[PDB]
Amino acid sequence: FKRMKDEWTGLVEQADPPIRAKAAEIAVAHAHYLSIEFYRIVRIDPHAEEFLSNEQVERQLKSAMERWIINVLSAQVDDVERLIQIQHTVAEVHARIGIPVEIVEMGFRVLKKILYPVIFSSDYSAAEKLQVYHFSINSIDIAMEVMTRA
């Protein structure tokens, strides 16, 4: 945990404050789309659709996915410890139900894929898009590692 906290903290610190601000801006403005786009693409997969069947979970997961994206992409130094606890909780939920790891990680790949066009279509410069995308990818990756290994 100590090593994970330091790395995630370092990721936020080494990320330029205007870049983290723009990443947070991208998150808040498009988290709703990213969540609903995530859900349908995932459910296309037969192995994944069996877990995303009912309407109640849909409304719950979309809201939770939206909150998750906002928390991770708008992460500050103070939020690092809390974010780690969140990934543990999510890991418990996925384990409680019995959702395979390779299916969840496929979702992370889906999430990272649909995030890029949103950043690419943003009003920012090419250099800023690169740094926002870099911070976003590393943040999602470290979050995935914490969730998986928990």
Give SS3 for 98.
coil
Say how far apart CA 16 and CA 22 lie, in whole Å: 10
Q: Which does 111 bind (CB under 5 to 8 A by kind): ligand HEM, a second copy, none?
A: ligand HEM
* 94 annotated as ligand-binding: yes
85 part of the interface to ligand HEM, by CB under 6 A: no
Residue linked to tokens 């109640």: 56
* 8 Å CB contact between 37 and 114: yes
Name the amino acid, one letter, at 5.
K
Q: Which one of the spans 16-24, 25-33, 51-59, 131-139 is the region binding ligand HEM (CB under 6 A)?
A: 51-59
Binding-residue total with ligand HEM (CB under 6 A): 22
Q: Which does 91 bind (CB under 5 to 8 A by kind): ligand HEM, a second copy, none?
A: none
99 part of the interface to ligand HEM, by CB under 6 A: yes
* 8 Å CB contact between 142 and 8: yes
CB atoms inside a 10 Å sphere around CB 29: 12
Q: At what angle do helices 80-97 and 55-73 cross, to 10 degrees?
A: 160
Q: Which does 129 bind (CB under 5 to 8 A by kind): a second copy, ligand HEM, none?
A: a second copy
Q: Which does 4 bind (CB under 5 to 8 A by kind): a second copy, ligand HEM, none?
A: none
**Residue 97 vs 127, nearer CB to a second copy:** 127
* Residues of each annotated binding site for heme: 94
